[PDB]
Design a protein around this ligand. Structure first.
Ligand code: VYJ
Length: 108
């Protein structure tokens, strides 16, 4: 759809290249990060690499599902980390761009 095309070529294009994008371009590696509780707390991991792959393979049936994947990625970050962590602020900056671009998505 026009909306999924927009999410791929506008929203993800802007978010993927952002200076703050790098921790979100692939799954949280709880083993490399020394986080034995990450998967005990975060039951649905999500990342931009997964979302990008889903958009490339036409995995989504509705723009709202892709939006939920973005939202889950950000919420995972806010829920697992501590309020003062830099990563929370990076998520907030990316999420603001996400919402700003979503405000201009084509209707269906
Ligand atoms: C794919 C790996 O990516 C990461 C990379 C680095 C990294 O600096 N080096 C630095 C030098 C690199 N060289 C340089 C020389 N060359 C020849 C070879 C390559 C090697 C790797 C750190 C963390 C990463 N990965 C991450 N992925 C999700 C999260 C995440 N870190 N952080 C953030 C903390 C501050 C910024 C990222 C979290 C940390 C704890 C708990 C949760 C989260 C979290 O919520 N997220 C989403």
């Amino acid at each position: 759809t026009n909306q999924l095309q927009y999410l791929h070529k506008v929203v993800m294009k802007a978010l993927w290249k952002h200076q703050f994008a790098w921790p979100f371009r692939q799954p949280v590696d709880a083993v490399k990060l020394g986080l034995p509780d990450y998967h005990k707390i975060i039951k649905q991991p999500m990342d931009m690499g997964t979302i990008k792959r889903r958009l490339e393979n036409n995995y989504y049936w509705a723009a709202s599902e892709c939006m939920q994947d973005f939202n889950t990625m950000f919420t995972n970050c806010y829920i697992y980390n501590k309020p003062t962590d830099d990563i929370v602020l990076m998520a907030q900056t990316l999420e603001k761009i996400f919402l700003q671009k979503v405000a201009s998505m084509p209707q269906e």
